[PDB]
Amino acid sequence: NTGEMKINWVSRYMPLLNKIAEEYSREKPLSGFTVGMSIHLEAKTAYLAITLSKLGAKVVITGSNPLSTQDDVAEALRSKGITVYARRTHDESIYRENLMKVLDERPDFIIDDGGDLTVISHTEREEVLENLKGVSEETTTGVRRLKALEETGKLRVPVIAVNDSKMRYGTGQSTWDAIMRNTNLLVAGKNVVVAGYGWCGRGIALRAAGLGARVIVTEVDPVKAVEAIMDGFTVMPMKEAVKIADFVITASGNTDVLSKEDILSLKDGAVLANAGHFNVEIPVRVLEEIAVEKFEARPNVTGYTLENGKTVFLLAEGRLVNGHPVEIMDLSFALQIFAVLYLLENHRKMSPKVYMLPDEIDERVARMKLDSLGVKIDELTEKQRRYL
Amino acid sequence: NTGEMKINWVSRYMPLLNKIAEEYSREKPLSGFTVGMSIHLEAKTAYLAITLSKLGAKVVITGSNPLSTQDDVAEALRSKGITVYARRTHDESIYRENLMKVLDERPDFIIDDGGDLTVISHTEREEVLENLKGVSEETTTGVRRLKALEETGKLRVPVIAVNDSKMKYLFDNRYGTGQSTWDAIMRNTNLLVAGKNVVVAGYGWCGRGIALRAAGLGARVIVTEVDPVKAVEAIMDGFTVMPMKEAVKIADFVITASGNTDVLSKEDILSLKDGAVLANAGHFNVEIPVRVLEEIAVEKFEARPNVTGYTLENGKTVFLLAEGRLVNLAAGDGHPVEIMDLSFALQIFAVLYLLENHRKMSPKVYMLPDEIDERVARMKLDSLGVKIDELTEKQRRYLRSWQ
Amino acid sequence: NTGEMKINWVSRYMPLLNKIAEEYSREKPLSGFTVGMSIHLEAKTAYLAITLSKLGAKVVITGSNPLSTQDDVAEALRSKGITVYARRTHDESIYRENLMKVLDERPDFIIDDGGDLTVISHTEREEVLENLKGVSEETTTGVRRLKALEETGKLRVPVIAVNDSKMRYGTGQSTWDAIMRNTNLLVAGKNVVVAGYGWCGRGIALRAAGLGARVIVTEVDPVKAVEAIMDGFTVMPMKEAVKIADFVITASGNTDVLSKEDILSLKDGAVLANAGHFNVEIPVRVLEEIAVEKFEARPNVTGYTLENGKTVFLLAEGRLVNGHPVEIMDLSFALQIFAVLYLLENHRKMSPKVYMLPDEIDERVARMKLDSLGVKIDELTEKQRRYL
Amino acid sequence: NTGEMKINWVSRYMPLLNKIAEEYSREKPLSGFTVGMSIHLEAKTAYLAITLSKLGAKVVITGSNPLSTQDDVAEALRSKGITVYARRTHDESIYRENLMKVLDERPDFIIDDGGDLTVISHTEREEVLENLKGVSEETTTGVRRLKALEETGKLRVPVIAVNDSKMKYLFDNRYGTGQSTWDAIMRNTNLLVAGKNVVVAGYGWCGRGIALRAAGLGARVIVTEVDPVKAVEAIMDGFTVMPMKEAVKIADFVITASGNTDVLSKEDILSLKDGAVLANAGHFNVEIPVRVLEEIAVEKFEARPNVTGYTLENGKTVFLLAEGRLVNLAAGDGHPVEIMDLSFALQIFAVLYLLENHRKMSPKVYMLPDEIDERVARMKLDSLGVKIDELTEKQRRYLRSWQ
Numbered sequence A, C: 001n002t003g004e005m006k007i008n009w010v011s012r013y014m015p016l017l018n019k020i021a022e023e024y025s026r027e028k029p030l031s032g033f034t035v036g037m038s039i040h041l042e043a044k045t046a047y048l049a050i051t052l053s054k055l056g057a058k059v060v061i062t063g064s065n066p067l068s069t070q071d072d073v074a075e076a077l078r079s080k081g082i083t084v085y086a087r088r089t090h091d092e093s094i095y096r097e098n099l100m101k102v103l104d105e106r107p108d109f110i111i112d113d114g115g116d117l118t119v120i121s122h123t124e125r126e127e128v129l130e131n132l133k134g135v136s137e138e139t140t141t142g143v144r145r146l147k148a149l150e151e152t153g154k155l156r157v158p159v160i161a162v163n164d165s166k167m168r169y170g171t172g173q174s175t176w177d178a179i180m181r182n183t184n185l186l187v188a189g190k191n192v193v194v195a196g197y198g199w200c201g202r203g204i205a206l207r208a209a210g211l212g213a214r215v216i217v218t219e220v221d222p223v224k225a226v227e228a229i230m231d232g233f234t235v236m237p238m239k240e241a242v243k244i245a246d247f248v249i250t251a252s253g254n255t256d257v258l259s260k261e262d263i264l265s266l267k268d269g270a271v272l273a274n275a276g277h278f279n280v281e282i283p284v285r286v287l288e289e290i291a292v293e294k295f296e297a298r299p300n301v302t303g304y305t306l307e308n309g310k311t312v313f314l315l316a317e318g319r320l321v322n323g324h325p326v327e328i329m330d331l332s333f334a335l336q337i338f339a340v341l342y343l344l345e346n347h348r349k350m351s352p353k354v355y356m357l358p359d360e361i362d363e364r365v366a367r368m369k370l371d372s373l374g375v376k377i378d379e380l381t382e383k384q385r386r387y388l
Numbered sequence B, D: 001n002t003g004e005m006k007i008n009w010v011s012r013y014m015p016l017l018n019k020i021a022e023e024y025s026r027e028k029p030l031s032g033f034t035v036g037m038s039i040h041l042e043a044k045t046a047y048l049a050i051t052l053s054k055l056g057a058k059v060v061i062t063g064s065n066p067l068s069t070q071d072d073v074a075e076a077l078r079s080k081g082i083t084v085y086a087r088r089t090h091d092e093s094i095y096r097e098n099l100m101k102v103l104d105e106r107p108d109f110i111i112d113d114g115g116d117l118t119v120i121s122h123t124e125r126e127e128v129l130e131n132l133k134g135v136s137e138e139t140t141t142g143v144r145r146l147k148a149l150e151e152t153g154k155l156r157v158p159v160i161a162v163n164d165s166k167m168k169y170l171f172d173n174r175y176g177t178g179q180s181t182w183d184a185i186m187r188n189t190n191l192l193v194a195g196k197n198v199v200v201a202g203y204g205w206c207g208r209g210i211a212l213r214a215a216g217l218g219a220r221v222i223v224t225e226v227d228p229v230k231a232v233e234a235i236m237d238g239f240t241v242m243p244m245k246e247a248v249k250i251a252d253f254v255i256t257a258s259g260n261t262d263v264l265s266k267e268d269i270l271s272l273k274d275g276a277v278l279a280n281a282g283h284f285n286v287e288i289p290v291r292v293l294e295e296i297a298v299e300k301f302e303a304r305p306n307v308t309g310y311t312l313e314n315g316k317t318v319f320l321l322a323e324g325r326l327v328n329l330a331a332g333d334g335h336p337v338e339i340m341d342l343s344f345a346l347q348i349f350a351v352l353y354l355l356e357n358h359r360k361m362s363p364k365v366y367m368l369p370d371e372i373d374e375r376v377a378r379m380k381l382d383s384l385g386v387k388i389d390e391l392t393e394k395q396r397r398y399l400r401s402w403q
């Protein structure tokens, strides 16, 4: 079975979930409990569900899945007694109905996505609050929403912010890897303009220089501009920089980092990419307004042909240009399972507030990972403990 | 349209090929000549074929495409009068038949891939040697094979080894062969590279790129070698060097980049950890001994697309990517556009040098003429708007003197 | 004159002090004021004194100077009407007497070193507090002492912490530059052990790997150990690591990072260096105790020959292994002059507390530096200000 | 004692030279031969002389030491029976006389510095050519000068160019010549490099190291060149390339690393900014035209130790380091110990190859024999305890075949 084969592949490479099953699948700490989940359904998340089931949980899952591609995985989970509501979830009203179906099962613990199950539970499905004991939230958007819910005084259950989004060549390595993958263009020997020289922009500039680019930085803060100069970059106004730029990367946290005049000064073939959080830095609406032709040049690359006859290329529709390997999801899933187990053990002692993941869980998972790698480390002596 | 769009993208970023067309497309120096090619077919190589055609050549191509893709690019080439045989080339006998199809056109010049067409011309299709005036070869495997023909006195045409180029040392191959190799591995496996033991067999241009990229991804890299100079290089790059027999004991990934045969033995294979992943970046599929895997395995199964599981007599299962064939070219991003533009420029000028000089050349493998490297470097500078200094007469006499 | 020539050299390359003189030497804002200074006396600090004099100040300086090497600079300052007490300052009681001599001049503003003039003014020389209007303190030790003085409720004058100690290949670049300079040894192809993987240790490890070393990390924190593994380093206990180490660099903030057994396992010729703040990390006393012979191998390198016949080398007597260029001191001096001018203008409105250098001064100096380099930067639009 | 302590330090970290002594000091292959040397004298080069003496050679040395230092090292060598003439060599006529002193000893082999001794032997001291059996030359300037003797038919002894070595490309020269050059500049000037415009003339081994180190220190680097290949390399490294005439207009530092003459013209000099700092890293002091500075300057003065101010007709003052002589060797840290150990090993084996083979060699400049690079790489691996793989017979036949 293709679904079973997908799961078998990931099962080979999720050592922490395998260790958690070895340690807890006889005790079955979640026997008699239901765990409701909203997650993107694929073999890796399936294995999290399977692991929770080995620990005794009744697992009920909604998959946010706009294609049919992982239906084989859904069907394999259903064969293992796990309840899966994932078909037709391209429609928004069906995703919400599937969330309602998870809540129909009166979950004891929720592994949420974006806070969706939890917010519904507090607003339209309050009857589930009786049985709901705790929520684990791994998404940054979810933790924000549940903190905002706390701040209104409406949160009724403990929430753990699993808070594992924190994750060699610095912060700019991922950005340039994505730019290279999406364009297949050389960075060496090119003029790269970086707008903003905070931690993000500096990383992007340093990596570009390591790839062999000549780097120009734009800034509005004189202190930051001096820093860029002392790192060996050229600083000049954007109006000048766009005239020679092969790449322009916005890292400013600002709006309209390029004007209409700036765009009309770009070289034919210039590549634009945003490394900030929102699509306002490169004014996509301005490109759409002034272009005489818009086309898909490559996957994730949009060409805009301008009134001056030149074409410029925008990566990823102006969104953050920079979906994880099996072992990384194994680590994230281990932290999430331990969060649910912590809530199981301690929820009666916890307030209806958002807690940061207890540091003990980070240390337990790290130790388990070292153990699975065969790595040994040092231990503090008595003299060293007395010193610290 | 999709084929044409792919070619349109690369055309915008191939300034040397575009300058070559500007300089020679009116003169048509290759008018009345056929250029035979063996390539991995994709937009960049299509642009090389297009440029040769603009110079007047009849261009006939076979694509080593076991991937079974780029048909759109093939159709775009066909609409421009370029003959392309790339379909079904996963089957080795179909790739060979397509080589024979190229030779049926009696090429005047060959731009080869690994010496494939040239070796056949010397061993099975000797009738084509009459008309064949010169070969351009870019790969280390091809140059080795053609040097082996020379050394035994069987080579009958002049060959220019373009891989000699001074500008090979220009680019850092970690974001050519390295990045494309690791992207392919990551796509086929979805496995983490960070914190893994990665073994690279061979520390030449290809293997060093693969090793540096793996270290960049957070792997601990172990290098195997037979050349002590190369092994010292690996050490000085910060890697561990040891014999394969030891390296296999701890390897999570083993990547072959040697150009040799049987870089793993049966005994090496039986020492691999359960779940080890094996991949080849060399020309031929004999580096990892696929036949040995097939022979000793208790069970064989397809684990996922492009991943074959082999369960061994010791109970362990090892995974082979892409049937031991070269892993990194199927996505069409083996090297950056501008790097291929440079490489292709050198190749075009090698062909033009053979056109001009072949009557004067022996049936030997020649290093790329230095004049070609300098031509292409100058055209690159000009395309960037860069000016440099010129020696004075005083300086020229100083350099020719002993003080 | 050799003193005059030293000053002339630095004068050519201190563009911010030259600009400050151009802007203020007609106004003479410090005319009628005395500025007392304790500083290491050399051509660069002389030029700060000269600049303050051009601004009208009577300048009275004590030099902490244990050699006679800058006596020519002292004599050139005296020729310009600046009062200098720097001879024989190798003796500690003479340094203190020279500080007393500065305080005899009843300074209006002090540019202190280590808080020495200020603490004396508050404890033994309280009569100077009448006329003392403000203190500028650039040293980290000085700011600590004056903050501690504040915390006892005994500080009587405003103090500005000039707070410019904040200063391409990361934090490890300076460390390795120093190790290379002091040993003349190759780093490529060596085994480097880094003890601790906080920001300091990580920087040192990353730079070592960039130099071509094979890097081993030791740690006591499993979370940090995992980080080092995912950066591509080998993690093992120090007891194992010392057996193969060519270099051992301590970056732990701990004591006795190497034991006696660890030291006796080092290879003949191993090099040890501390990148932490205190000389407890590598137990220098233990090396001194167990060595059969101690010698100076090279400047800044001590050899210890052990009972096992092997010799190991310690850099910089176990102190932080990693004194600035003219233009860097120009920047520091500009911030200090502006701190004194800020105190001049505002001291009547300030409490007797330690203030951080006002951000306006950082921005003014940065802008002056950009201006002197001919660099132009961008300016926020109205839309951008409204967005932020 | 201080001299001996300096030598004791380097001896601990020169494993190849120590292994050479272990292997050949009992046999004494150089017994009855004199080896003449021109070196910058310091502990590392002293260890090379010591090692040659352990092999039986009579060693006679002149030190290019314009610095006026390492007398302690000279005295240590004298106590070991090695003849050293290094004092007062700031004066060019004294350095030349010391070269003549080496030639007075009728060396059988010369280890040269820039071809100095060999060129004199051919031009002024031809009587020594009878006994001279071979020359080893490590520098690009030396090889050029000796090639110029060959090309005019004036060379009379075989020369091995050790700079050909495969292992030059091993090390990254930013922490050899680069770091030592910038340390010297920083010592002589106390000026900031970060945020400055640095111009490097020449992008070979020396200049690329200087440029990369400057970029590492935070400089904006501009490269000048006459070779288009080298200029493209500089571009691909992230540097700006332009003609010197333009580069001088914005330069804070100009560093010459060309091996040529008159890399600045009078017109270039008159375009420099007030306060520009000029330094040379080439062999000879003609790269920066010191005589032109001396001729056109309105005033000349010593600004600080090792720094000459020249005030020009345009009112601007420019500063020259070390009288335009090579700036980076005076501190004795030109390269790391282990790098010089490698280089010296190659040189010793070059001498031993000449001892064995000179009767069979033409009076030509030869590339370093590949066998020597492989010997030294293997000894390096052995010293590190590294083992590598050996080719099988199947593999050897595969590599000699054309498939």
Ligand SMILES: NC(=O)C1=CN([C@@H]2O[C@H](COP(=O)(O)OP(=O)(O)OC[C@H]3O[C@@H](n4cnc5c(N)ncnc54)[C@H](O)[C@@H]3O)[C@@H](O)[C@H]2O)C=CC1
Binding pocket: B114, B139, B140, B141, B142, B177, B201, B202, B203, B204, B205, B206, B207, B224, B225, B226, B227, B230, B257, B258, B259, B260, B263, B281, B282, B283, B284, B326, B327, B328, B329, B334, D389, D391, D395
């Ligand atoms: N995948 C791709 O994109 C590309 C593939 N290639 C192919 O990759 C192969 C390697 O090419 P290059 O790096 O240019 O060759 P190279 O000759 O520069 O390096 C190959 C290295 O393998 C070493 N080696 C040979 N047999 C070995 C063994 N049994 N164990 C360990 N090391 C061994 C050699 O000593 C040599 O240093 C060739 O087949 C070449 O055609 C090359 C370039 C592109």
Ligand SMILES: NC(=O)C1=CN([C@@H]2O[C@H](COP(=O)(O)OP(=O)(O)OC[C@H]3O[C@@H](n4cnc5c(N)ncnc54)[C@H](O)[C@@H]3O)[C@@H](O)[C@H]2O)C=CC1
Binding pocket: B389, B391, B395, D114, D139, D140, D141, D142, D177, D201, D202, D203, D204, D205, D206, D207, D224, D225, D226, D227, D230, D257, D258, D259, D260, D263, D281, D282, D283, D284, D326, D327, D328, D329, D334
């Ligand atoms: N300071 C030191 O520690 C060392 C000094 N040297 C010396 O440095 C010099 C350079 O040596 P390498 O880098 O090995 O030589 P190289 O031949 O590799 O590079 C010199 C470069 O200078 C370029 N060039 C020549 N004339 C030029 C001009 N007028 N303007 C700009 N570029 C020009 C050439 O095209 C070449 O690329 C030689 O004199 C050599 O003996 C080399 C090694 C050590």
Ligand SMILES: Nc1ncnc2c1ncn2[C@@H]1O[C@H](CO)[C@@H](O)[C@H]1O
Binding pocket: A195, A196, A197, A198, A201, A218, A219, A220, A221, A224, A251, A252, A253, A254, A257, C378, C380, C384
């Ligand atoms: N319009 C802009 N252009 C360039 N840099 C900017 C702009 N707006 C903000 N920044 C800078 O971006 C960095 C990250 O917010 C800050 O250092 C800030 O000064």
Ligand SMILES: Nc1ncnc2c1ncn2[C@@H]1O[C@H](CO)[C@@H](O)[C@H]1O
Binding pocket: A378, A380, A384, C195, C196, C197, C198, C201, C218, C219, C220, C221, C224, C251, C252, C253, C254, C257
């Ligand atoms: N004895 C030690 N050995 C190694 N790392 C240590 C030791 N003591 C503290 N550290 C680590 O050093 C880093 C900086 O304090 C921290 O990550 C801490 O865990």
Ligand SMILES: [Cl-]
Binding pocket: B195, B196, B197, B220, C229, C232, C233, C234
């Ligand atoms: Cl590891």
Ligand SMILES: [Cl-]
Binding pocket: B174, B212, B213, B215, B216, B217
């Ligand atoms: Cl990388």
Ligand SMILES: [Cl-]
Binding pocket: A229, A232, A233, A234, D195, D196, D197, D220
């Ligand atoms: Cl700059």
Ligand SMILES: [Cl-]
Binding pocket: D174, D212, D213, D215, D216, D217
């Ligand atoms: Cl550097």
